[model samples]
Target: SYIEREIKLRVISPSLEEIEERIRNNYTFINEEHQIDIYYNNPIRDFRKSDEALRLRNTNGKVILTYKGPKQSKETKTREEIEVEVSDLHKMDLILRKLGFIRSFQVEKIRKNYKYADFIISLDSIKELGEFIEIEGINKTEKELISFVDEFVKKHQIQYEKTIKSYLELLVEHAKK
Candidate 1:
């Protein structure tokens, strides 16, 4: 998190009016975002390849450098997200050596979600993580973004309980057979 890990409130309603109220009156949200995630479960034989090509995350005013690789796995996914945060650029060289996550990649700037009654479609590219296509201000405009997840019974959707947790888990299972 760029703004120091916001305590996000997850509401599965077909409405974001409540979310707006919560962000304004209750919680602290620095950069509001609407993220539509698409994760892949394909077998990744070259684990280190993804790590070598990864770029650090830029949130708020912080620069997060990559630390580890896809060295570990679960039944669903096989990626670990650990990084170092340094305030000064001069200290990065020494700090990166100490942490051993030195990558010589250029930093990129990313614009964030806005609190406007507008329309825009965007695709953001990630280094290791696959493409993330997101829509912003839909709920504020058409009042539909609030219905991102159709209402269903709790047990039917509680953590995908019966099914495997993530693509990583699926990938691991595939490798075994």
Candidate 2:
């Protein structure tokens, strides 16, 4: 029901400290969190082929199940998303299984959040992938979202390589190789 627009980039040299310093100097700290995301595959349809995702995320002692639709943007990662809180992780897993969904992959990360203007900047250390940065803009169109993140990168002197693939995709590939 909502448009989610964001960008994921690989953090280059001088990585973690530099990013933390920049956020400290220019942005307001939100909170740090450890999040575990379990992705599921629909038995009847290929979610990957449809470019969609179903995930159960556990964070801060709470769990949420999310469904994300196909990417809507060419440059930035934008999609339609819906989420609902789940009280019991085990029961939810069973429910998803009963619905013919199977666990596909798991992505775990320690995320540090910061606020800059209208954007939420996240520095994520993913378990399978290395360090990555995500800039998510609220109520922004694809073009605007990309522009905002691009400007922020330039301003912060961030040395990064952009990545369009999601962590789930990357993990699947990693498992293959």
Candidate 3:
């Protein structure tokens, strides 16, 4: 199991250019790919109430099943995550269905990953939502990581809206509107 601490930020429309420029200068670009994340729901239990998630993500012909624990803290998006690669998407989907899991929602995005020092930064263009940035802390505290993000925002003079909701939650909200 791997624990991940992450925070999402909406790229203030006007500040998008500057944010991209700043990252271009400071971070090493990794790779970009289109990802489709299919979320599942258990018939007998509510994962939302527990703030947990079960998703099968397909990217570059690879499928992975990921289970995320409920948020650990209020200040940042922190969770215990376990992911395993599935050899056959068809088999896995059948297994989940046979277990009475329903397909709930899906989030699709073109994500560009970058590495800056100890952080993993993802610039995402979500299918329905638009652009956003996700910053993750690897070997640092939430306090330290956010501080670094804060300093960059200040230094670059970029305006941003901090987000605590996952993309799945965002999709659910969008459907209600």
Candidate 4:
């Protein structure tokens, strides 16, 4: 969880249009995509925990389930994700049927992304728990796959005021025991 550059954003909104406009404007520094937005949720089996975890991601028009675990990093905490692309609600239902034990527990996760940062829709739990948007790849300082989450907050509007601490933290807040 230790990052070289840790930042939190306070700007958040429910309007995708305004968020898209912000990206179209200041995002000139990044041309990878004049516009890119993806909304997906990560569902965890109620009592699933270990070094590795699976993520079922549904993007703009695609669905991919992934498995991730901590990656070997000498300097920071790293995680690896394995994913399988899925299409349609039936497919998801089938997955549940095959792994029904996973759905029978008290599973939870955080809804976060780096957009307004790329289009992101995070649903940490199935019962209306937590959700957030993120904008990534805005930094012009390095050859990076993502941008500074801090600077992104300053340049744009609509965020949670405090950058998302951790999905773990979000979990504590929702089903706060």
Candidate 5:
């Protein structure tokens, strides 16, 4: 029901210490979360080819199921996102399996969240992937969101490569290589 507009950047710098310090200085620090995301694909359709995603995420102990529609923009990962809290992760997985959904991949990360204005910033350290920063704009248009992310990156002097690929996609690519 909501549009998820966000930009993901892979940190190319040597260390994350400087970047973390900069974010902490400029943004209001939110609590850190340990997330384990399990992705599933429909048996009838290829989510990879469709550019859609179904993810069940366990953040700390809380579980959430999210469905992301195809990307709507090229510059940013803009899509329709629907999410719901699930009481039982295992039961939900069973339900999905019974419905013919196949388990695809899992992405685990330690994330530190920060808030500045209407943006929520996440600094993620993945086991397979090194470091990444995701900035999500709240209640903003595509143009506004992209502009803000650009300014934020410039202001922070972050050395990064903007990526449109999701962590799941990146992991899949890594596995192939």
Candidate 6:
């Protein structure tokens, strides 16, 4: 029952390297990771309509199943996130399918992580969606989280377009076009 407070910024013009350089210069670099997120929908409930999400994420081969509640803040993508580690990805996928949950979408990304103050900053190169930067707060409130990320970007002078949509949502929209 952890609250996840974060903001996403989409990089449009400048290369990902430019943003990476800025983060690398200022923040402590964490390890790079490859992530594959498999989103699921319940048999009887539409998570999209409810603004909730269930996901099985494989990060560098470590699997975690996460459930995200509805957005709690209008300004940032704040929500309740419950996660549990699973031993086997395929076994969990099979179990989910057996339980009648439909696999909805998959989002793949290469992420370079950094740490600044209390925030975890990620430079994500998403497949089919170009590059994005995500700033996540560990234990901050929605207002504090938003202000910190906003100030961080301003301080770095990073060019970005803000978006609150999740990767799953963006991928769905991309498929429509």
> How much does candidate 6 score in TM-score?
0.95
How do the predictions measure up, each by TM-score? 0.31, 0.95, 0.94, 0.45, 0.95, 0.95
* lDDT of every model, 2 decimals: 0.33, 0.88, 0.86, 0.40, 0.90, 0.90
Better of 2 and 5 by lDDT: 5
Give the lowest summed-lDDT range of ten residues in model 1.
1-10
lDDT of 1 by residue, 1-177 (tens): 111111111224422443334334323334633322212111333333453233444455565554334434222222354567657544654554565544432423232332323323223232332232233333232234323212211312312121212223333445576
Worst 10 residues of 5 by lDDT: 14-23
Supply candidate 6's per-residue lDDT for 14: 69
Of 1 and 2, the candidate ranking higher by TM-score: 2
- How accurate locally is residue 60 in candidate 4, as Cα lDDT from 0 to 100? 46
Q: Write the per-residue lDDT of candidate 5 for residues 21-86, one digit (tens) a residue.
A: 877777998889999999999978999989999999999999999999999889998889999999
lDDT of 6 by residue, 32-127 (tens): 999999999986999999999999999999999999999988788788999999999999999999999999999999999999888999899999
| Candidate 1 TM-score over all chains jointly | 0.31
Candidate 1: global Cα-lDDT? 0.33
Candidate 2 lDDT by residue in tens digits, 1-177: 888778998888558668798769779999999999989998789999999999999987689999999988778777899999989998999999988899998999999999988899999998978899999987776778788888988888888988778899988888897
TM-score of 5: 0.95
- Candidate number that wins on lDDT, 1 or 3: 3
- How well does candidate 5 score on lDDT at residue 96? 97
- Judged by lDDT against the true structure, how good is candidate 5? 0.90
Give Cα distance to truth, residue 59, candidate 6, Å. 0.5
TM-score of 2: 0.95
> What are the root-mean-square deviations of the candidates from the true structure over C-alphas?
12.7, 1.2, 1.4, 8.2, 1.2, 1.2
For model 2, the superposed segments whose C-alpha errors exceed 4 Å read none
Off by over 4 Å in 6: none
Candidates ranked by lDDT, best first?
A: 5, 6, 2, 3, 4, 1
